Amino acid sequence: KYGEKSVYFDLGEIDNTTGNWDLYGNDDPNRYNGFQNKFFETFAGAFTKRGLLLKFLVLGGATTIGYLGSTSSPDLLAIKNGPKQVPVMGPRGRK
């Protein structure tokens, strides 16, 4: 898009020609407070690495799921509570 006339094809401006624009992209550098950034970059910056994040996520999820499953109280889960009534006999007297 040269834009001077009804011309919309221009090899000089190929990003305009192909319509490769940023619709809402905003590049103002000032968003947050300095001390907020200090705190968040100090604490949340540990999880930046991605392979370590994968390993930590998998190990933590496995540990949490196993601990909750194996230590859940009977008053919460019915499967751990177990049966409380007398069993019912089968049709032909088969138990």
């Binding site: 499953g69 889960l77 019915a78 499967i79 509570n81 049966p83 009534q85 069993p87 089968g90 138990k95």
Partner: peptide, 15 residues
């Protein structure tokens, strides 16, 4: 061992 059961199912499947 199905966590999604309720108590009546636990009673009913104890054969």
């Amino acid at each position: 061992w199905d966590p999604h059961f309720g108590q009546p199912a636990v009673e009913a499947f104890t054969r």
